[PDB]
Amino acid sequence: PAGIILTKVGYYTIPSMDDLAKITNEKGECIVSDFTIGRKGYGSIYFEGDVNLTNLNLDDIVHIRRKEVVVYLDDNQKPPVGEGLNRKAEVTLDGVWPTDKTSRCLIKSPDRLADINYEGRLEAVSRKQGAQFKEYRPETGSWVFKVSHF
Amino acid sequence: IYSLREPQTPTNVIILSEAEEESLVLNKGRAYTASLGETAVAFDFGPLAAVPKTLFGQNGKDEVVAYPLYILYENGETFLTYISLLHSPGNIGKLLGPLPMHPAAEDNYGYDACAVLCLPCVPNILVIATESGMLYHCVVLEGEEEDD
Numbered sequence A: 001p002a003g004i005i006l007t008k009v010g011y012y013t014i015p016s017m018d019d020l021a022k023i024t025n026e027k028g029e030c031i032v033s034d035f036t037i038g039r040k041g042y043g044s045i046y047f048e049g050d051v052n053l054t055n056l057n058l059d060d061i062v063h064i065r066r067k068e069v070v071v072y073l074d075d076n077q078k079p080p081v082g083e084g085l086n087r088k089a090e091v092t093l094d095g096v097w098p099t100d101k102t103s104r105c106l107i108k109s110p111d112r113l114a115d116i117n118y119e120g121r122l123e124a125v126s127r128k129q130g131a132q133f134k135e136y137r138p139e140t141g142s143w144v145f146k147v148s149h150f
Numbered sequence B: 001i002y003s004l005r006e007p008q009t010p011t012n013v014i015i016l017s018e019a020e021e022e023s024l025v026l027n028k029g030r031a032y033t034a035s036l037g038e039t040a041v042a043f044d045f046g047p048l049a050a051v052p053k054t055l056f057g058q059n060g061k062d063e064v065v066a067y068p069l070y071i072l073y074e075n076g077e078t079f080l081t082y083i084s085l086l087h088s089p090g091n092i093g094k095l096l097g098p099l100p101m102h103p104a105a106e107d108n109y110g111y112d113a114c115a116v117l118c119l120p121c122v123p124n125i126l127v128i129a130t131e132s133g134m135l136y137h138c139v140v141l142e143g144e145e146e147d148d
Helices: A110-115 A118-128 B030-035
Strands: A011-014 A031-039 A043-052 A062-065 A068-071 A089-093 A132-137 A142-147 B040-045 B065-073 B078-083 B113-119 B125-130 B135-139
Touching (some): A031 A062, A043 A062, A043 A068, A068 A089, A068 B030, A110 A118, A118 A132, A118 A142, A118 B030, B065 B113
Parallel strands (some): B040 B113
Antiparallel strands (some): A011 A031, A031 A043, A043 A089, A062 A068, A089 A142, A132 A142, B040 B065, B113 B125, B125 B135
């Protein structure tokens, strides 16, 4: 109903696209309180507040890779701050583990990750991006952060 | 690589990113790759070297001779590529790495890598430097052949 497009592989929403198709109002308007999007085993993006999703192509607007996440990726298509998805967000990327310079495998021990201070490095470059660091999770490789706009 | 004969067009281009097979998307991940150290920061040439015979297929009788370009990332991963401006580009100039740094460090030998120097000696000595003021002295040696 809502003109939302989401067809790319491993991508999902909360509420689900079939739940979002229930809360679309008779007019063809769809506003969601606390909307989450994501790509399985790679990450998620959460929009604290109310979000209008009407007539949006998510397969062009939102991309999640290994160790990369973003919204409105042609900056000529980027709407103003607070319009569409260009607003404050909690973002997680999963499987954020560093490479061992000698075994060439990803470092998946919490003890080893504490001993390199990986958490404080992820805080350091969250801050260089102007983002607010929230929590790292060594077990999943989840880096969690807030951002103001995209 | 740009020529002064053709100063606006690159005589050779080398992508350092493993991104083969996925085209047709834009441009904004440049924040998150940098935080993880996945940016190339510095490079240097070792001396002219004979290309290891396993990189070309089994049908060349001549020895091919190229410059070994050592490339440093901000995470302190080093990569190699062999470069000639004299030979056809057929499997010349593929990227090789990450290069394993012995012995295995538990701090990972830092994430603030910022300069690199490839000293003209045999075997090569590669100096890797960090913003903390650390300098690592890497002797470059050919890998092992694994017994079956």
